[PDB]
Amino acid sequence: KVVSTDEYVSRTSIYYYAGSSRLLAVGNPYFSIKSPNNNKKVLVPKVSGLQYRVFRVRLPDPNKFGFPDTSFYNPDTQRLVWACVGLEIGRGQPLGVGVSGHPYLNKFDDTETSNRYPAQPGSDNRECLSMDYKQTQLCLIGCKPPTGEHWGKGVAATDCPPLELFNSIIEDGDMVDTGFGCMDFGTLQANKSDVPIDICNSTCKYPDYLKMASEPYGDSLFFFLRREQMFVRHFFNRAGKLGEAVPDDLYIKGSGNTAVIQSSAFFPTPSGSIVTSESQLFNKPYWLQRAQGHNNGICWGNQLFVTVVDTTRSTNMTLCTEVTKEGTYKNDNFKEYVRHVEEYDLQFVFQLCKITLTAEIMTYIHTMDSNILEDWQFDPLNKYTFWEVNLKEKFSADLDQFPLGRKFLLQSGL
Amino acid sequence: KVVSTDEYVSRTSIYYYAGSSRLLAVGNPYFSIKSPNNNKKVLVPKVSGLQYRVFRVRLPDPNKFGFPDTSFYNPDTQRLVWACVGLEIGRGQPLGVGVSGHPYLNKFDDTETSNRYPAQPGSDNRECLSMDYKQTQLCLIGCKPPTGEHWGKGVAATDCPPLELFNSIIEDGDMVDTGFGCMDFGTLQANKSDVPIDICNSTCKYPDYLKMASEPYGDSLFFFLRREQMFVRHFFNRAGKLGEAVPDDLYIKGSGNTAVIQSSAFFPTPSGSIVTSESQLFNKPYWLQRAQGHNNGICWGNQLFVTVVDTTRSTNMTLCTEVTKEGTYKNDNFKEYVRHVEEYDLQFVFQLCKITLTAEIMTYIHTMDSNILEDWQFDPLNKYTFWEVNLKEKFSADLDQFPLGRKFLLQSGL
Amino acid sequence: KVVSTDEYVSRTSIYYYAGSSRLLAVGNPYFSIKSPNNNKKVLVPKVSGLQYRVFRVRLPDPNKFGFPDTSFYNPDTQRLVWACVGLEIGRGQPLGVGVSGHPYLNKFDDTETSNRYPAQPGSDNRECLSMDYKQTQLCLIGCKPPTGEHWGKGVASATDCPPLELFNSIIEDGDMVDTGFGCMDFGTLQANKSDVPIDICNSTCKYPDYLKMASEPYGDSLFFFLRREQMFVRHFFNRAGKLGEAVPDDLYIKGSGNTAVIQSSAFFPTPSGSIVTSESQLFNKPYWLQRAQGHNNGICWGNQLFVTVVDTTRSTNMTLCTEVTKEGTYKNDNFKEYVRHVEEYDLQFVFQLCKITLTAEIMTYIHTMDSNILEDWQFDPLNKYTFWEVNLKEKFSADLDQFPLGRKFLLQSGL
Amino acid sequence: KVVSTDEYVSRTSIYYYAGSSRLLAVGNPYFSIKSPNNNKKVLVPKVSGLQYRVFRVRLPDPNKFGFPDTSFYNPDTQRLVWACVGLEIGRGQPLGVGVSGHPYLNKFDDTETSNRYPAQPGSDNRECLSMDYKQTQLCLIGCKPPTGEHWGKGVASNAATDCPPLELFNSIIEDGDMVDTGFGCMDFGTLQANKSDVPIDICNSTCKYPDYLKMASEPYGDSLFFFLRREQMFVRHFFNRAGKLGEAVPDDLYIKGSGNTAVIQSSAFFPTPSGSIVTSESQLFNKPYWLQRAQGHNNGICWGNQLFVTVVDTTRSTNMTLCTEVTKEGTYKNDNFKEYVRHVEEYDLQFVFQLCKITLTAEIMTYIHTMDSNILEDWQFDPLNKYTFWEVNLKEKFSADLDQFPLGRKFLLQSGL
C-alpha cells in the first residue's frame, strides 16, 4: 500500500540553505501574567525550560520560486517539493539547572529515615518547598506536528477517578513530564497543591513515540533524539484522607502511640542530576540521509515541524529592584522577580526534488493527502499554537556562506 | 543425545511480521482491591513496575495457515513451524522512579552515625517510611515459560526457620527482587512489617539463569538481556528479640548505660540510583541470529513466551479528589490515591521453517516432546497466569509496512 | 562574496616556534585592593579562577623580519603574514576547586525538605554562606577578540520588573564567566548586592556568543574552540523581601490561621559543578589547526592573536595566616586571615609562514574585508580594552626540535 | 644545539632484567615520633600515602660489568651506558582511603546552608575535625631528580596590606615530601602561622606539585623520560575561618546591616576536599610501561649509571587502627586501652634495561662534555647526597635470563623476541 518516497520523488543536484536568525523567549518560568482589566491579553508570557518548543517552519513554494534556471524540470508534467537533508538546532544560553516549587506544597513528613508515631496532620500542613525536575533533551523533525500522550480523567468500590490515556497534538508551550508522570494535574489533582505551581494547573505531555513510529506514511518522525535522566532525591507523604486504606493482611495493627495509622500515600521528589557539555544533543549537525519511516524527509505542504525540549539551559535569573534606598538593608525595601530566557538558532539545508506526475503517482498522492495535489494546481493546524518560523525570504543557494552549509559541503564531499 | 535445530529444521525465504497493538495496565502499585463482598472478583488489580510481565504469545498454526502458494514444501513428508528472528519490545510511558513503603515498618534506630546507649523503651516502635527499590531491567524470550528461584520455609540451637531454595514458573504479576533478596516474605517474615507492603505478603522471584542455561534442549532462553544496579541508601536495625545473640568472644561486656546490649539485626535500604535513556534495553530491535542453546529460536507448539522486567518507568501517579469545596484548604476535604500504568507494544518478525519428518527425526522429536508430533497430526500451562497475546490474526507478509519489518529488511540486506 | 583563505593564501615550508615564558597572576579571588589614595591604582589585583584570560599575543612583522634567505618571495608583488598551525596552552598549579560566598547572602529558608508554617521574617535575615561555582573549561583562538553575551537592564515601556536586554560586548581579560546564576549584569539587575556572592555581585558575567562568532562572514573570531561545562543543584533556598509578582489565585487554595500569610516563592538554587579530573582536562595537550570550520584557516591578520581561556579546575584559594601577637595559648584576635589565588600559564605556538600575491582582485577583496591590512603592508581601536599582552616579537625561533610543542609538531607532520 | 640520543647512542641486542625485592615502609601517617636520645634519632618515621616516593636506583657500571663475551664493542674507542626500556611499578596492599584531621582545626561555622546572625563570640572556637584528601596518582621516570613547585613566603617592600608576599619556589622533590592535598602546593609552616588552618600532617610541612612545565621544557630532557598522572577531588563541605579578617570586604559590594546583623561575619571561607572514589580500573600501577620513544631528547638513557623513579599513590592510603589493653577488666572502660594509628606502603620495582655503546669521537666528546663533564670523567677517557632519596641498589640484581621473571616474560612477548 505505502511505498518509500525514494521510489516516486526524483532528487536533483540543487541545494539551498535556510537559516532563521536568533529566536528569543523571555518570561516568567512559573506562570503567565495577564493584563487587567483585559483578563485576556498576556503581558509576560510563561517561558520555562520544561516547555515544548514546536517550531512551524514555513518554506517557500518551489513551484513559484524564482530560480535562475528552470531547465532542470518540466512544469507541464512535474512538480517540485523541498527535502530536508541537513539540520542543526542552535542553543545559545549557558548550561544550568533551574528549580520550581510551591509555597503550599502538600508535604507532611520526610519518610526517609525517621517518621515515628504518633502523627496526624491538622487541617493545613502544606509547606513551601522547591525541587529540580527530571532532565530531558529531545528533538523531533517531521512535516506533521508530533502526537503526545497524557493521562486524564476517564469515565464502584473506590472513589478514585478513572484514568484514560489521551492522544493530542503537542503545541508550543506545553509542559513536558517532570518526574510526576504525564498527566492532567488540573483535573486529576483537585487540591492544586501536590505538584509545583508551573504544572499544578497544566497538562504534562510525553511524545507517543510508538504511535508516531507506527503510522503508515511516517510523516511525524523523520528523525529524533532523546536523552532523559532522573533519580529520587527525597521521600515524602501526602496529607489528607487516604482514599485506599492498606488492607488488613499487609500489617499487624498497633496500639497506644501506634494506634492511629499514618498516611501511606508516598510520593518522591525527582532530580535530573548533573548536566554536562558532553551529553548535549544540540549545536551539532544532523544529516537526514535515510529515515526509518517511508517519508525520507520530504516536506509536503512546504512546511516543517521541529520539536525541541532542552532542560540543560533552565537557569532562572533572579532580579531585584530597590524600592526605597536606605543606609541599612531592609527586606521591605526590595522586590524580587524571576525571569527565564531561551535562545534558539535553527539552521536547515534543503534539497530540491521533482515528482513526475503520472496517473499512478497522482492516485497515490491523492489517497495520501488530497491537499498536496490541490495546492500544486494540477489550514486545520491554525487552531493550535506554534512558534512560527518564516523562512520564505531566508533561502540561499550559497551554502559555503553559512556554518551548516560549509559543514554540508565537507560532509557530502562537494 | 541433543542436536541443534539447525541440523533438522530447514529455513525458507518466507518472512512474516506480527505486531501486538498497544497494551495498557492500570492499577494500584501496592495491593489489589477486591469487591466487598465477593473475595473472588478483583476491581483494581495490582500493577507495579516491580512485577514480572510474562507474555504468552499465541501463534497461528502454519500447517493450517492460508498461504498464497504452498509449493515450497511437501505436506506429505514435511511439517511447518515458526522461528523467531526479529523482536522489539516497545515501551511507552516516560522514564521515572516510583517509591514503596510501609506505615508500620520495623525500624528501630538509625545505625549510620549516632545510636548511643540506652535503648528506646516501648512495645511498638514501627515507623511510616518509604524507599526506592533496586533498579532492574531484563527481558527473556523463549518457547517455554521461565523458571525462577526464591527462598522459602523448609522442613527440619536456633529457632530460625529452615531455608529451602525453590524453583517455580514465573507467572505474570510475580514480584521481582527489590534489594531485600528473592524470598517468600509472607512465610519467612511473620510480623508483616520488615519490608514494604507490596512485597511483605508476596514472593520475590529471581530468574534461575543457571538452570535455564544448563537445560538440554534450550527451550527457555533463546536470548536474554539484564541490567541490575543498586546501592545502600540507609542503615537501620530491627526491633524485637534478637534470635541469635552475639557470642561473648566478639565484644567486651558493658556497664551502666551500656549494660543492656542492643539488637545487631541490621538491614539496609536499597536505591536503584538513576535512570537514563542511554542504559535502556528496550525500544530497540534484537536479531536472534544464533542462540547459545541448541534451540535456535524455533517456536514449538506455535506459542511464545516474552518475560519483561522494567523498573525504569515505575512512576506512581498521585491522584486527588475534592470531596468538599471550600474557600480555604482543609486536609479532610480531599482523598489521595496512588495509581501506576504500564504501556507495552510487542513487535515480532518470524521466519517460516520446514522439517522433513524422517524416522530418525520423528524419534528425536518424540523423545524431546511428544505433543509436537501429536499436534502435527502425523495444556498443563493453563493453571498458571500469563498475559495472553493473541497474534493468530496479526501475521502479515508485507514487512516494509511496519517499523520492525523495515528494520529487518535493512539488517538482512533484503 | 567571502571565499576561503586556502584560495588566495599560499602556504610555505617555513615553520617557526614561539614560546612565552612563565606567566603568573597573584591576587585576591573576590575583589581587587586599591590604594587609599587615587582609588584607581591597584595594589592587589583580582585574580580568580572564574575569570576570562584573554591573551593578546603580539607577533613580529614577517615583512620586516630578519630571515636568513629571502629568495622564497617577491616583495614587489607579495606580502607576508603568519598562520597558526600548532597550539598548546600550558597550565600550572595542581587541580582544585575554590569557593566563594557572601557574608550577607539573601537567604531566608531551606526549601528542600522542611519549611513549615507560619513564617515570621525580619528586616535583615541575610546569612554568611558560601558555595562552589559551576565548573567551566573553554579555550577560543582567533585573530579577533571574542564576542560575549550578557543580559542587562534595557529601556522599554505593567509591572516594576526591570526590562531585560541581550547585550553583546568584547570579552576583556578579567571579565567574570557565568557561575551558575546566568550571564547577567548583577550590578544593575540585583540592586540589593546580596543575591549572589561578592565576587560577581557588582560585576558582569559574560558567556561566549558562540552563534554570533560562528555566523560571522570571514570567521576571524573562532579558528578553533573547546568547551566543557557542568553543574548540578546542591541546595534549594528562597529569597527574602517583597515578592514582586504574586502567585495567581488559580494555582493554589488560600490558607488560614498559621498559613494565612503566604511564604516567598522566589526560589534560587546553588550550583556546584561536581568534580574535576585529569581525564577531563582540555589543556596541556597540543591542538593542530589543520582545517578551520570558518573561511579564515588560521591566518593571523595584523600580526596579532587572541587566546581566550577559562579554567575553573584550578580555582584553589590559598589561605594565609599572620600572627599579630604570639602567646602560649590560641586566641582568635591574635591572627589575621587572608585569601589569595594564583594562575600559571605557559603559551606555546607553532606558526607557518605564508605569502599572498597582491593582484588587483585580491587587493579589492582584502580592502573590502579590512583596509588596515593593506595600509599596514605599505602597498589601534582595541587599545580601549584590557588584554593580557604577550609580546612574542623576540621569541620566534626556526629550530622546532629545541622545544616541546615543536618536537610534537615534527612528529605529527612527519617532518 | 641539542640532538636526540638516538643519533649518537648505538643500541645493542643485549638486555638485562633488574628487580628489587619487596620494599616496605611502616610508620605514623600524621607525624614522626622521636624517642630518647631525641631530636636527632627517629624510632617511628612518618609514612603517609600523601608523600612522594623518590627512588634513586643505583645501576652497576657497564664498563666494569662482568659480561660473558665482550666482542660486541671496542673498549678502546667506545663506552657503555644503560638505557631504560621496560618498567613496572609494583604496588602491594589493598586499595583504600585514609583520613587526616586536626584536634584544633580553625573551623568557625558551616557556611553551606545555615549561618544566621549574630555569630558566637569566643576566643578559641577550634574544633576536632577530619577529612579525606584529594586523590592523586603520578609517576615520573628520569635520570635526574624531579623538580617541584610550591608557594612560600617571599620578600615585600617596606602597601596597606599585612598579607605575606608570595613567591613561587622550585626545589628538588625529596623522598617524604608531601604532595598537594586540595589546599594547594604551599608552605603551610611559614604562610599559616596559627598552625591550625590545615590538618596536622601538612600544617608544619610543605606541599609540592611537580613543575611539569619546567621539566618538560628543559633542553636535554633528563627529568621526564615518561610520566603518568591522574588527579581528582571535589568540595565536600564549606566552612569559614575564625580570627581577624585581614582584608575587609569593600563597601560597594554589600549593604550594611543593623541590629543582629550589625557586626559582619568573617568571609574567609575554605572548603574541605575529598578525592571521591578509588577503583582498580583507574589504577596506574601493576602494569608495564615500555619506554620506546620519549618526547624529550633523552630516549631513556641512564647517565651516571643511576635512575630516579618518583611515585605518588593515594589509592592505598588506608590507616590501620591499633589498640592495646593496658588493664584487663570484665567491663569496657576507655582508660583501659591505648589507640595508635599506623600506615604501610609496599613497592616492588621491576626494570628491563638495554645495553648501549657510544663511540667517543671528538665531536661526540665535545657534545657530552658540554652536556655533563662528569660523564666523560667517570668513563676514564656527589652533590645529590645532601638530599633524601630511597636508595634502590640493583648492582647485584642484574640478570640476563629475562624469561625467569614476570616483566622479562612480558617484555619478550611485547618485543616479539
Author numbering:
A (entry chain D): 20 to 174, 181 to 403, 438 to 473
B (entry chain E): 20 to 175, 182 to 403, 438 to 473
C (entry chain C): 20 to 176, 182 to 403, 438 to 473
D (entry chain A): 20 to 177, 181 to 403, 438 to 473
How do the authors describe this structure?
HPVs are nonenveloped, double-stranded DNA viruses that consist of multiple copies of the major (L1) and minor (L2) capsid proteins. Here, we describe two antibodies, A12A3 and 28F10, that specifically bind to and neutralize HPV58 and HPV59, respectively, through two distinct binding stoichiometries.
This 1:1 Fab-pentamer binding pattern is similar to that of the H11.B2 antibody based upon a low-resolution cryo-EM structure. In the HPV58p:A12A3 structure, the antibody binds across two adjacent HPV58 monomers—a and b—with six residues in the DE loops of different monomers (Q165a, D154b, R161b, Q165b, S168b, and N170b), and one residue (N308a) in the FG loop of monomer a. We found that HPV58p bearing an R161A mutation (HPV58p R161A) showed dramatically lower binding reactivity to A12A3 than the wild-type (WT) HPV58p, with a more than 70-fold increase in the EC50 (603.0 ng/ml for R161A versus 8.5 ng/ml for WT). Moreover, the decrease in binding because of the mutations is a result of a faster dissociation rate in the surface plasmon resonance (SPR) curves, indicating that the side chains of D154, R161, and N308 facilitate the stability of the antigen-antibody complex.
